[PDB]
Design a protein around this ligand. Structure first.
Ligand SMILES: COC(=O)c1ccc(O)cc1
Ligand SMILES: COC(=O)c1ccc(O)cc1
Ligand SMILES: COC(=O)c1ccc(O)cc1
Ligand SMILES: [Zn+2]
Ligand SMILES: [Zn+2]
Ligand SMILES: [Zn+2]
Ligand SMILES: [Zn+2]
Ligand SMILES: [Zn+2]
Ligand SMILES: [Zn+2]
Ligand SMILES: [Zn+2]
Ligand SMILES: [Zn+2]
Lengths: 28, 21, 27, 21, 27, 21, 28, 21, 27, 21, 28, 21
């Protein structure tokens, strides 16, 4: 559905999760 | 890894939900 | 009018943290 | 909380560094 | 303080729609 | 309207999906 | 004047069009 | 196509106006 | 609710100016 | 000032062009 | 610490400088 | 040049401070 890296990926996570919050762990 | 799912590969909005708390 | 709200907060976190990664959880 | 603090009042990038993994 | 206003709305539309594309027209 | 609705009140990504081509 | 793709292109369209609104149709 | 004008090629702000409603 | 504030201002400057570059200084 | 003007009231991209180098 | 180009670089400068303001001069 | 420091190469937040007024 979408190619997302860096700050765009994080903004996408914010939109989808919202109040739930999220974790961005790019290394593992 | 979210990067290999959605940066290095292509992923969906339900796949992005996996990383919500 | 203010500063790091919503979308801008998580962008600032990515800048500050980067490859380290970060957790985002409001109250 | 930091998310509320950054939006309600002042936030430094130094304070935001606490939330890195 | 709120949520998807102005610039952030069209960014959310791009995410949701993507290659499909989208129309943006306020009232 | 959706643009006003998203800014004035709550909006879901599901509601925004109506405006895709 | 500028190389613009994806979400950046869309934000650019929002800025230039504004109240007029716009259509993003990448496929055609 | 806006993509071939402004993503795949380089385009101006007046070229972006073509896609306003 | 308004328009080009903070982060959005410098993004609009980059669009308008680009390779020319620009200066940003509030009062 | 432009930064305050754009945030407090209306701003055109034409007015912002004054701040390019 | 970070690879930053275009509008992302500028947003980064805004965050770090803030009230101090900044100059974006990519050519020199 | 900020571009060669931070776009073409990798740079730190203190390196970005060099370009504040
Ligand atoms: C485009 O709408 C969705 O499919 C969707 C998926 C996950 C969400 O969290 C929200 C919307
Ligand atoms: C940089 O200023 C312009 O040339 C411009 C072009 C189209 C617009 O809609 C606005 C400004
Ligand atoms: C992550 O925190 C810093 O190291 C930092 C560096 C420069 C600043 O201006 C602010 C914070
Ligand atoms: Zn931002
Ligand atoms: Zn914003
Ligand atoms: Zn941004
Ligand atoms: Zn945004
Ligand atoms: Zn953004
Ligand atoms: Zn980007
Ligand atoms: Zn913006
Ligand atoms: Zn943006």
């Amino acid at each position: 559905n979408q190619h997302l890296c860096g700050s765009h990926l994080v903004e996408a996570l914010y939109l989808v999760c919202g109040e739930r919050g999220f974790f961005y762990t790019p290394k593992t | 890894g979210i990067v290999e799912q959605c940066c290095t590969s292509i992923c969906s909005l339900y796949q992005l939900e996996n990383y919500c708390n």
